[PDB]
């Protein structure tokens, strides 16, 4: 953009943390001017706290309104636990099974296939376990991954690669474990 | 530990841009569009199991504007330092010839949230089918964005995500092409 007037940003974030369902809940109110967080409410404390000098004024001010502190201490119940109950059926409980493919590839462009890709996509939630096997024996060495990748449409994907010399007669198995299935997904590729 | 729900709003001057959204574990449940004053759901199904009165959002952007003005004055007009984005371009899944798929453009770790983003097919900008997210939050207080472009993949077609941002001296391009 042909536009170089300075910018000024204010953000406000209320984060609810849940642990072990609804059994433990910690709320955080932060506000942030231009990349620096100035002041914070933590439900573990029950008061506002300045994070920088710039926000000591606003802590003192908010900390003097007892109707406000009382609301915020209760929010763990009326807000957090509220939204958790409302959202649970379709966020906490959401489950989408991965599509799994195997296909061979090359670490260098015009060399020999020396790289098996295990593609795991369209899954939710994000906790996965992906493991390679040669002839029913797990291969721990020569494995790289893209990491877990979030598509931004409530699905995740990952590529998990095994750098190998494919010797003919060998059976490779990519094995995936995921909350959406009760026993391991497996796809085989014959060298 | 296990799950995180975030309510994130911002206000940015002098563009006068507001945003308000809810985020479950990094994924967005909904945002409110300032222009139409209505709740946009990230998935249509969410509209069927939940509701949100969008007037609460409007009311909070009003307060955040008033707040930003105060904070601006008090900092003696110290402005945000531009942080340029990382960009990657990925597929929805492994691509086969003639099988519809979706190119994703991930824009990440940037501030403030103004960002111009174009998709290019063989150099030429592409409008049909594109769609995108609003800016999502980050623990470090920078932003993330996604752009999307469904496409029918082929040998003789190349694409790029082209991103411009104030913290970048040049437009940043990320290429993708069918490899087999």
């Amino acid at each position: 953009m042909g536009d170089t007037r300075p910018r000024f940003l204010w953000q406000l974030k209320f984060e609810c943390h849940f642990f072990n369902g609804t059994e433990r809940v910690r709320l955080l109110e932060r506000c942030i001017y231009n990349q620096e967080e100035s002041v914070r409410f933590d439900s573990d404390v029950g008061e506002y706290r300045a994070v920088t000098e710039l926000g000591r004024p606003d802590a003192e001010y908010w900390n003097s309104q007892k109707d406000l502190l009382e609301q915020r201490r209760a929010a763990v119940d009326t807000y957090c636990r509220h939204n958790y109950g409302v959202g649970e059926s379709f966020t906490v409980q959401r489950r989408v099974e991965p599509k799994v493919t195997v296909y061979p590839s090359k670490t260098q462009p015009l060399q020999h296939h020396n790289l098996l890709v295990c593609s795991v996509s369209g899954f939710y939630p994000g906790s996965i376990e992906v493991r390679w096997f040669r002839n029913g024996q797990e291969e721990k060495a020569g494995v790289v991954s893209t990491g877990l990748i979030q598509n931004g449409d409530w699905t995740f994907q990952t590529l998990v690669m095994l750098e190998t010399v494919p010797r003919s007669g060998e059976v490779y198995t990519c094995q995936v474990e995921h909350p959406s299935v009760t026993s391991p997904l497996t796809v085989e590729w014959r060298a | 530990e296990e799950h995180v729900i975030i309510q994130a709003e911002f206000y940015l001057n002098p563009d006068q841009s507001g945003e308000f959204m809810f985020d479950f574990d990094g994924d967005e449940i909904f945002h409110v569009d300032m222009a139409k004053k209505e709740t946009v759901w990230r998935l249509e199904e969410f509209g069927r199991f939940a509701s949100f009165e969008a007037q609460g959002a409007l009311a909070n952007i009003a307060v955040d504007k008033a707040n930003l003005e105060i904070m601006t004055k008090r900092s003696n007009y110290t402005p945000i330092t531009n942080v340029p984005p990382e960009v990657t371009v990925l597929t929805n899944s492994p691509v086969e010839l003639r099988e519809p798929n979706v190119l994703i453009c991930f824009i990440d770790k940037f501030t403030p949230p103004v960002v111009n983003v174009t998709w290019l097919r063989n150099g030429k900008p592409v409008t049909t089918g594109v769609s995108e997210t609003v800016f999502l939050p980050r623990e470090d207080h920078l932003f993330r964005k996604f752009h999307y472009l469904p496409f029918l993949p082929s040998t003789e077609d190349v694409y790029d995500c082209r991103v411009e941002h104030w913290g970048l001296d040049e437009p940043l391009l990320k290429h993708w092409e069918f490899d087999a």
Binding site: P57, A75 | A59, N67
Partner: peptide, 14 residues
């Protein structure tokens, strides 16, 4: 499975 609640933003001291 219900209506979602927004928490309310608080003006700073002018």
């Amino acid at each position: 499975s219900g209506p979602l609640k927004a928490e309310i933003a608080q003006r700073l001291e002018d």
